[PDB]
Design a protein around this nucleic acid. Structure first.
Lengths: 87, 206, 60, 226, 129, 97, 96
RNA sequence: GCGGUAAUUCCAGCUCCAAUAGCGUAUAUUAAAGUUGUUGCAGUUAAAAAGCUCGUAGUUGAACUUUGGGCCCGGUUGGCC
RNA sequence: GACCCACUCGGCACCUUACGAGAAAUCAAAGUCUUUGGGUUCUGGGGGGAGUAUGGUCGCAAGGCUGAAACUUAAAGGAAUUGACGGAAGGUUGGUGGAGUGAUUUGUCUGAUAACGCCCUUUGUACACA
């Protein structure tokens, strides 16, 4: 997204989707950003730090965003079992 | 990531199973959601409670991440659910809405009931469809308390629970509220059963 | 349609109207001079009120 | 005299704009935060000028006699790389125009402008072949080389000049005489530039943290008695 | 009657891409399709596919990563000649700076940029971007 | 405008049925399209039932009913019989009441 | 596959169909049938010179109510009876 | 579409605009006409799917018949050398 | 033999979405088409003139099949929308927000709630000086 001599042009680098990698865009209001806080031993939330997930508008419209979110959070490592890869 | 503290205890399981949350829908499991366990006779499909607890912990963990507790908004049209949301607002932060949702809420100002929530929670997506659809036009994630028969449009971290009433939805709400008090609060680990009872939420007689 | 018609009025209006003459004036300077003149009246100052301008203003 | 300015920051963006926490519109574009108030994008970037486009009357037969109204298509823009198309209908002409401008200011969208083929100083054309539709009118925008100009219909051409798209080819289908549809199609097309994966955009960034959460305690919907 | 199998494969890939999947089943595969998916895989429009074996046809389970906008067949495979490839790019590809009109040469099934440097051409096949 | 999906009442995957004669006007019309009604009225009405039951020989006995299938011609169905004309949304509704 | 044959070796059906289906538009029909030369008053030429017959008073259509003052003309070349309008204000008294 | 007695469209005159030693008018034709469409049209209701089936020519027609691994030789790109 | 439960192939159609498509009405296919190529037969190119004339060919006949031009006109239609009408059925207006590409509609409504602060409704319409 650059010119010839370094200098990065192309204003605003879009957000990729977490689920399908489709570009969520400026006008699109159906898209969502989920923020999950970082737990540890000694309990409690610990504000400041977030594991983020950008769900697209289409994914939410179609109505299988839930499944995608179950998948995404699992590989990060905050769900023992829950969602089977197999079916 | 996944500590040994935040696990499904037997007492909580015995509460859940007492409440009949594990009894799923009569008619059909919607194909969008796989949270099924043994198609038992007499037309009932049992839900994985280990998942239910976990999804609840996810939702709670999401809620705890939001900086101001006032901006979250619980929604309900079922009287039981209305009571529950009022209790959720009584204990934790998060201003509720009971009864008629009063459309045009999350959309543009001018109305009195103008709220711009970071996050929204719903009892039933079929009965509060207008709320779900309202949320989509201003970057509001939804966390519904779905059943097997219910939809899952515009929903995130949908929790599979029985949403008929009596003692069911209130139990789920109790679990959520308790969880989010345990996070960002002064409560101890699994040892403490907490002062407030599950009997407080449930239903509203007569 | 019909071929018959009142042809007696053929050139009614061209006749009865008053036949006055052209007024003599200063000579319009032609070619490049004309272009110069156009450029001057347009891109200097004088225009109508509002954003839009009338190049041929009526006296009023 | 007895006057006062009165901005009145309703919604969560107003306070941010007034306090001066967010300087640019890039953040807004990233997180898709819906601009309700027109005064947000005005003082956020004063360089955002304007434009009109077209005015046509729209009539309405009734019991008594006949109602009449004036529709104004007001396209607004700025020569860096942001544009808005605002259609409005009202009984007065000035009222139609002002409201149209407001609507155009509300719904602004940026344009991913790139090169024809070679890479050089300053982008001039569109990044990709984009197309937008509205009714019969499908408008297509094809990238052109340097100093080629905006080869299009006068309305679409104006829309593109507002954006600061120097060089670009266009086509169209359907009954293009209606500007109601054509300019909407053009808007859809220039909008879909950012919704298209080039290879340089596959390099996955970390997902920026939402700015709403950074300054939630500082500047947001406060209680406040008087 | 399945007239072109490559066409069917590509149809399947596109529909699944539009519906927002990460994976597809396609039938009944070929050499041509495998070569095609290798060409695609080299530049990285798709992930690791897998040809299963059954004594008749062969199904492919393709894993796609959502870099693929649209790829499509060009039937009937016309005959292309040195500089016609450029004209083809102008017709169907979105920009000059990326995308691949894939085509079959006597050298082998190959993208257009490699054919320019190898200095060969032949029957055209689909495109990718 | 194609004003119905069904077009005629209940005929798909056939192409022809045997027509029936309308009871009221004697108009010919397909058997599917006849807007039919099961009339199930008594031999004696609620007005005539009491004295007639009192003065009859044998206790209770029977007092049967007349059964017949009334057919119609659409025109007759709207003019005389209950059916009405309905809205675009109420065209979609199927229940008898 | 969109109606028409996209076969590689089926040029015949494409060209033939097009030649059959060209017979619709005005210019193709006017050219190939030879209609300008066969039929019509002029012989496919721009200006045709003619004599006259008589002056007319043509009753014009609605809404444009007037009398038009045309001339019936017999031409030189074919010698067909034609009607022809006379332009400008007045100017029917020039011709006889 | 203007003209039924106030014509911003006619007749003149004032002023203005276009092109400018050159403009207007015809008929033919090219583009726009993705209104011929291979690239590139349409065919439920706007013109248009032939009553339906068979069937010769014509058009099109599953997959499958050697990839990989190396060993060197070795030209072309750009920068420290 | 029948029925119930779960799965299964082949259709008859249906109900809900709109992912998409469509100018719309609407469509699980009229979708997978300017990001315009699965194969392939048939038909159309403004409306009248005309499914007429002329020619052939088919048939006992009626007609069918194939099927023009000159001339004439600035429309013709399609969909939906507001009224207006019916010798059809029953008993006021913007602000902001949605529903729509708009016309506009919703609000300003069945007797609650996509809204928030002679008259009417639904349908038919080739009328729209009605």
């Amino acid at each position: 997204m650059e010119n010839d001599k370094g200098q990065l042009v192309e204003l605003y680098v879009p957000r990729k989707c977490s689920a399908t990698n489709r570009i969520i865009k400026a006008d699109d209001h159906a898209s969502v950003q989920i923020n999950v806080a970082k737990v540890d031993e000694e309990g409690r939330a610990i504000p400041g730090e977030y594991v983020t997930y950008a769900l697209s508008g289409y994914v939410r419209s179609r109505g299988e965003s839930d499944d995608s979110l179950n998948r995404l959070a699992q590989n990060d490592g905050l769900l023992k079992n829950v969602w089977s890869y197999s079916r | 990531s996944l500590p040994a503290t935040f696990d499904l205890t037997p007492e909580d399981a015995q509460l859940l199973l007492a409440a009949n949350t594990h009894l799923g829908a009569r008619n059909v499991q919607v194909h969008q959601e796989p949270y099924v366990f043994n198609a038992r006779p007499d037309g009932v499909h049992v839900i994985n409670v280990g998942k239910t607890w976990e999804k609840l912990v996810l939702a709670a963990r999401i809620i705890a991440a939001i900086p101001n507790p006032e901006d979250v908004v619980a929604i309900s049209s079922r009287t039981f659910g209305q009571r529950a949301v009022l209790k959720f607002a009584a204990h934790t932060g998060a201003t509720p809405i009971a009864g008629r949702f009063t459309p045009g809420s999350f959309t543009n100002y001018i109305t009195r009931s103008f709220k711009e929530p970071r996050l929204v929670i719903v009892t039933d997506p079929r009965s509060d469809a207008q709320a779900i659809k309202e949320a989509s036009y201003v970057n509001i994630p939804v966390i519904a308390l779905t059943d097997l028969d219910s939809p899952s449009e515009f929903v995130d971290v949908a929790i599979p629970c029985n949403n008929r009433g009596k003692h069911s939805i209130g139990l789920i709400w109790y679990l959520l509220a308790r969880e989010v008090l345990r996070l960002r609060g002064a409560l101890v680990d699994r040892t403490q059963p907490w002062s407030i009872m599950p009997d407080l939420y449930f239903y509203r007689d007569p | 349609a019909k071929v018959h018609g009142s042809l007696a009025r053929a050139g009614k209006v061209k006749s009865q109207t008053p036949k006055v003459e052209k007024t003599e004036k200063p000579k319009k300077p032609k070619g490049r001079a004309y272009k110069r003149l156009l450029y001057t009246r347009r891109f200097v100052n004088v225009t109508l009120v509002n954003g839009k301008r009338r190049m041929n203003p009526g006296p009023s | 005299n007895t006057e006062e300015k009165g901005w009145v920051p309703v919604t969560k963006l107003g306070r941010l704009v007034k306090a001066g926490k967010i300087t640019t519109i890039e953040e807004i574009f990233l997180h898709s935060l819906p601009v309700k108030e027109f005064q947000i994008i005005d003082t956020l970037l004063p360089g955002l000028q304007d434009e009109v486009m077209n005015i046509k009357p729209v009539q309405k037969q009734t019991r008594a006699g006949q109602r009449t109204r004036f529709k104004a298509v007001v396209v607004v823009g700025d020569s860096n790389g942001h544009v808005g198309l605002g259609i409005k209908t009202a009984k007065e002409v000035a009222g139609a125009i002002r409201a149209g401008i407001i609507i155009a200011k509300l719904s602004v969208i940026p344009i991913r402008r790139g090169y024809w083929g070679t890479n050089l100083g300053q982008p001039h054309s569109l990044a990709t072949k984009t197309t937008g539709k509205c009714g019969s009118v499908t408008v297509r925008l094809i990238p052109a080389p340097r100093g080629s100009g905006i080869v299009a219909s006068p309305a679409v051409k104006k829309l593109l000049q507002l954006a600061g798209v120097e060089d670009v080819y266009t086509q169209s289908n359907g009954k293009t005489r209606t500007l109601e549809n054509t300019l909407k199609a053009a808007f859809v097309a220039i909008g879909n530039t950012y919704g298209f994966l080039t290879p340089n955009l596959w390099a996955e960034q970390p997902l920026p943290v939402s700015p709403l959460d950074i300054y939630s305690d500082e500047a947001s919907a406060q209680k406040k008695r008087f | 009657t399945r007239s072109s199998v490559l066409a069917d494969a590509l149809n399947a890939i596109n529909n699944a891409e539009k519906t927002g999947k990460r994976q597809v089943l396609i039938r009944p595969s070929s050499k041509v399709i495998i070569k095609f998916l290798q060409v695609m895989q080299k530049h990285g429009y798709i992930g690791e596919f897998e040809y299963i074996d059954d004594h008749r046809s062969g199904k492919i389970v393709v894993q796609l990563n959502g870099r693929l906008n649209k790829c499509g067949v060009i039937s009937p495979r016309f005959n292309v000649k040195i500089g016609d490839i450029e004209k083809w790019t102008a017709n169907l590809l979105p920009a000059r700076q990326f995308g691949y009109v894939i085509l079959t040469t006597s050298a082998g099934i190959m993208d257009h940029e490699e054919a320019r440097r190898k200095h060969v051409s032949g029957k055209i096949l689909g495109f990718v971007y | 405008p194609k004003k119905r999906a069904s077009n005629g009442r209940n005929k798909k995957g056939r192409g022809h049925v045997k027509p029936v004669r309308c009871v009221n006007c004697s108009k010919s019309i397909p058997k599917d399209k006849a807007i039919k009604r099961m009339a199930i009225r008594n031999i004696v009405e609620a007005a005539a039932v009491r004295d007639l039951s009192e003065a009859s020989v044998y206790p209770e006995y029977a007092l049967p009913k007349t059964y017949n299938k009334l057919h119609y011609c659409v025109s007759c169905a709207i003019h005389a019989r209950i059916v009405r004309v309905r809205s675009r949304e109420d065209r979609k509704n199927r229940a008898p009441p | 596959g969109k109606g028409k044959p996209r076969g590689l070796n089926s040029a015949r059906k494409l060209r033939v169909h097009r030649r059959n289906n060209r017979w619709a538009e005005n210019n193709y029909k006017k050219r190939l049938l030879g209609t300008a030369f066969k039929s019509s008053p002029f012989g496919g030429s721009s200006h045709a010179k003619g004599i006259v017959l008589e002056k007319l008073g043509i009753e014009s259509k609605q809404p444009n109510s007037a009398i038009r003052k045309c001339v019936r003309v017999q031409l030189i070349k074919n010698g067909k009876k034609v009607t022809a309008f006379v332009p400008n204000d007045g100017c029917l008294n020039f011709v006889d």
